[PDB]
């Protein structure tokens, strides 16, 4: 069996790559690929072997038992909990564990809204009624709560922005690169200013943890820390409430639904995740020895790419998986992933989602998308389900 170039696609592939990934479940679990990037990876598709393999401990997440090579700047990043196994895994979560329950979310709650409340008002002040909805609203948001929660000044939030639509959406393969080493060497420098300044951010918190005793979380695990924390809501939940707003206002009847009984708003915001969730590929996994799935053997140290977006259309574990509909049993899907990864922050994308939505649902009469589907960009990473831009227009 080739290797299915995902490139060669190309398209098309980008608007749409479920079809693909369908095709590809129909003959079994795992296929070896190349992405529009070009690396030879596995994927994992289909609901049930794809919840396995998030969960399975013979598919590790250490870069150790990985045959592919990393430059220096991905290696200077790559001390955090989700390129780790256990122990270390369990010793790096424990730290910041507390910080992330529902009940310590919550208490963001008035802080949240108060962002929400402020990003729409000035909105919702264009002359024209018409706004991107990336720019108002779904980029802000996140970065502005994760930022305060971290301690990231303000002036320096904007450089994120560009470091992400480079780390995770590159244009050109040297300056990810660049983009990595700048974003290392900025947070090394914000980790030193908070020493001896007694703040009680997180990042400062941390930095007390790590100079009380360097066995705690060494000094490449704090800047690991940092830099995941940070860029993990950039690329996932600014793109959940971007791509289930489109949902919605594309769904004309679900959004009538949710106007006319805002209590189904939780469940519309789950089957954003199911339908449309960002992750669309999760995060690389190197088997630790030959795995077989049905007869296809994956070799050691080789990379394994679980396909939420396909577990998410198959057809047996979600009926009329084509469907977004906001009253579905969205139980068990694995927009947060599954087993000892399992999303930290769902707490608080779910807050910053429930919000938002609401916000927006309440305070935008009339509010409809201001292009057709069909002129809507999608960026081609097939790692990242996002948008390029969302033109939205409500009445003034
Ligand atoms: C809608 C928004 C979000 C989605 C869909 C999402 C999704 C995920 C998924 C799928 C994983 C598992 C990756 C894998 O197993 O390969 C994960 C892990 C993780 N997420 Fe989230 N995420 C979101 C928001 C956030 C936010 C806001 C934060 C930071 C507060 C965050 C922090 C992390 C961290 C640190 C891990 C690693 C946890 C571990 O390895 O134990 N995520 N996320
Ligand atoms: C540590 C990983 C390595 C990948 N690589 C090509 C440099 C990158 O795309 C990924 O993604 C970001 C956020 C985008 C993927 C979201 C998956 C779940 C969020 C957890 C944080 C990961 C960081 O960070």
């Given at each position: 069996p080739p290797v299915l170039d995902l490139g060669a696609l190309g398209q098309d592939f980008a608007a749409d790559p479920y079809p693909t990934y369908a095709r590809l479940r129909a003959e079994g679990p795992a296929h070896r690929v190349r992405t529009p990037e070009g690396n030879e990876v596995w994927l994992v598709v289909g609901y049930d072997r794809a919840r396995a393999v998030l969960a399975d401990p013979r598919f590790s997440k250490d870069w150790r038992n990985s045959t592919t090579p990393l430059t220096e700047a991905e290696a200077a990043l790559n001390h955090n909990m989700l390129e780790s196994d256990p122990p270390r895994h369990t010793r790096l979560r424990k730290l910041v564990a507390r910080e992330f329950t529902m009940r310590r979310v919550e208490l963001l709650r008035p802080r949240v809204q108060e962002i929400v409340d402020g990003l729409v008002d000035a909105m919702l002040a264009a002359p024209d009624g018409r706004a991107d909805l990336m720019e108002s609203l779904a980029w802000p948001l996140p970065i502005t709560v994760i930022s305060e929660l971290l301690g990231v000044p303000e002036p320096d939030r904007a450089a994120f922005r560009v470091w992400t639509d480079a780390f995770?959406?590159?244009?050109?393969?040297?300056?990810?690169?660049?983009?990595?080493?700048?974003?290392?060497?900025?947070?090394?420098?914000?980790?030193?200013?908070?020493?001896?300044?007694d703040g009680e951010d997180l990042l400062s918190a941390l930095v007390r943890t790590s100079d009380e005793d360097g066995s705690r979380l060494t000094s490449e695990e704090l800047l690991g820390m940092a830099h995941i924390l940070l860029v993990a809501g950039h690329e996932t939940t600014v793109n959940l409430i971007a791509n289930g707003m489109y949902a919605l206002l594309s769904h004309p009847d679900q959004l009538a639904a949710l106007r006319a009984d805002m209590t189904l708003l939780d469940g519309a915001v789950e089957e954003m995740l199911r339908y449309e969730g960002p992750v669309e590929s999760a995060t690389y996994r190197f088997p630790v020895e030959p795995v077989d799935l049905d007869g296809t053997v994956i070799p050691a140290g080789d990379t394994v790419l679980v396909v939420l977006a396909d577990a998410h259309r198959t057809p047996e574990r979600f009926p009329d998986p084509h469907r977004f509909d906001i009253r579905r049993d969205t139980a068990g899907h694995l927009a947060f992933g599954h087993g000892i990864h399992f999303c930290i922050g769902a707490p608080l994308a779910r807050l910053e989602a429930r919000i938002a939505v609401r916000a927006l649902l309440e305070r935008c009469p009339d509010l409809a998308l201001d292009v057709s589907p069909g002129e809507l960009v999608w960026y081609p990473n097939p790692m990242i389900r996002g948008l390029k831009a969302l033109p939205i227009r409500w009445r003034r």
């Open positions: 995770v959406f590159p244009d050109d393969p040297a300056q990810a690169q660049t983009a990595m080493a700048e974003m290392s060497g900025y947070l090394s420098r914000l980790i030193d200013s908070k020493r001896g300044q």
